[PDB]
Design brief:
CATH topology of one domain in chain A: Immunoglobulin-like
Order of helices and strands of chain A: EEEEEEEEEEEEEEEEEEEEEEEEEEEEE
Number of domains of chain B: 2
Largest sheet of chain A: 7 strands, mixed
Number of helices of chain B: 2
Strand content of chain A: over 45%
Helix content of chain A: under 10%
Number of strands of chain A: 29
CATH architecture of the largest domain in chain B: Sandwich
Bound molecules: 2-acetamido-2-deoxy-beta-D-glucopyranose
Assembly: dimeric
Helix content of chain B: under 10%
Shape of chain A: elongated
Distance between the termini of chain B: 57 Å
Radius of gyration of chain A: 29 Å
CATH class of the largest domain in chain B: Mainly Beta
Chain A: Heavy Chain of antibody MGD21
Strand content of chain B: over 45%
CATH architecture of one domain in chain A: Sandwich
Strand order of the largest sheet of chain B: 2-10-9-4-5-6
CATH superfamily of one domain in chain A: Immunoglobulins
Entry title: Human monoclonal antibody with a LAIR1 insertion
PDB class: immune system
Distance between the termini of chain A: 63 Å
Radius of gyration of chain B: 23 Å
CATH class of one domain in chain A: Mainly Beta
Oligomer: heterodimer
Shape of chain B: elongated
Largest sheet of chain B: 6 strands, mixed
Number of helices of chain A: 0
Keywords: Antibody LAIR1 insertion, immune system
Structural class of chain B: mainly beta
Number of strands of chain B: 18
Order of helices and strands of chain B: EEEEEEEEEEEHEEEEEHEE
Structural class of chain A: mainly beta
Chain lengths: 336, 210
Amino acid sequence: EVQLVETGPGLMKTSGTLSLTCAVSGDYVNTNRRWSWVRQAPGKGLEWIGEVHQSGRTNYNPSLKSRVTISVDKSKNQFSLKVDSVTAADTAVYYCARASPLKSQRDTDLPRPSISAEPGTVIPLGSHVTFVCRGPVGVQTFRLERERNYLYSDTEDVSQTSPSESEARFRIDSVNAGNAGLFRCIYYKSRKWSEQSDYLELVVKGEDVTWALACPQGELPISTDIYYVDVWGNGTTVTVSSAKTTPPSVYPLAPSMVTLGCLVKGYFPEPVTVTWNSGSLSSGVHTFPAVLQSDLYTLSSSVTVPSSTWPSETVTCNVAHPASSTKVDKKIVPRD
Amino acid sequence: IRMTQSPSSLSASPGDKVSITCRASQHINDSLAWFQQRPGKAPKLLIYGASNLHSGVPSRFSGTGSGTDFTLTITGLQSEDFATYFCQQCNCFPPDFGQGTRLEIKRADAAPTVSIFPPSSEQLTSGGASVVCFLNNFYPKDINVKWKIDGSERQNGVLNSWTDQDSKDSTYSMSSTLTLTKDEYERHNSYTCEATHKTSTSPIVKSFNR
Ligand SMILES: *[C@@H]1O[C@H](CO)[C@@H](O)[C@H](O)[C@H]1NC(C)=O
């Protein structure tokens, strides 16, 4: 089975550069996949960070693109993420993921081919572009075709890339206005021609400030295939703070059933482990999520016991802070 | 392209048939995926291409839609189905997620158990004074907390904390802390913690003097 493992720090100093790596198992990174990163703040939803394509091409969420760098190392079967000038706002659980061109199996003998463009579909004047036609294994000829002038180009330079797929590449060294248009793929296999692929628009952008354009402006697709995240890593929690290691201050909380508690104030960093009577009391406990009290953490933990057991028997809260290597016990004594 | 999921929260019980909506700001054909996220866990792909079930997902999960409106239907709910659900557009860059819909367990209404605690003698003999209040095991989620010092409302120095739906009794809990100096705390007598919740017209008041 396919596994993705995140690696990196837990803590990152404010205005620093966060560095994460994803180790891929049961697959090859050098395949038709989009190796991606997603992040989730402590109480928020999911935010798409960016992705890296087989061609080495990168796409990043505009919200934060300037601070983003996604790379891939085929030799080590891994991909990485670097984040510059990190602030408290960059606090989250970071996930590495695999995006795949999933297909509901409709055809098996001659499946409908796919058309892609590298580096993209919006090419500057005079620059190059390559179309990649994808089909099943055993194709003898691939054909690229133009809509407006209905010109075509055939190739027998076919190469197997996976146990199920095969491909051909068509390069235009220097694009002009008359090269822009709609392009498709069709292949010949076993005395038969396939169904033609979907069209893919190629635009050649002008060399001036005034140049401007079913996706948004310039947000033209680069493939007829839709990529979907089908595998997620379990995630790595990253905390961005200029704070120092600080052990907690443990304060007791005294008032048929009775609720007692403990206040765990001013520590850095999360987590803390709170137990009651060394785990013997567990059925009625509530430990609350920590809040940020001026760059230090604070939490409370409540315990509910019968009135017959307290103050007649001792109730103690056990507070452990692994980071500072501290382990404290606090007895709950009554008030008048 | 903005994705708008509705409702933000839905309450149901096991065995029930439910439906979640996802709306796109522009036509996106059938290029929509559904993800499932259980508390404490990593996401999981359920549905791709609006209507296609990913390999190994139960037939209870059904996805439907084209263009701008997309629906997720779970018929005959099981305990493991109470989770957060996100929809995602995958046609245009950036392929942005919806804000999520949390599916929670609809249990019987339950009032909060309110407890107030004065500063500890150890915290005080160090210059600090935190007044802690607990609002435990209440249903539904919607609750309002208020602090009163000598009959006067107080908002400054108040820090609140909410637990997720309890995995055992399906209730919710909340902790509110009013923090001040030993000097400031020693100038007043009456400290109140007031809880307003669906289960009562009159708020629950818990006080201490000195
Ligand atoms: C990921 O989380 C699941 C929890 O269901 C666990 O089974 C798995 O071992 C974890 N670790 C890895 C490396 O996937």
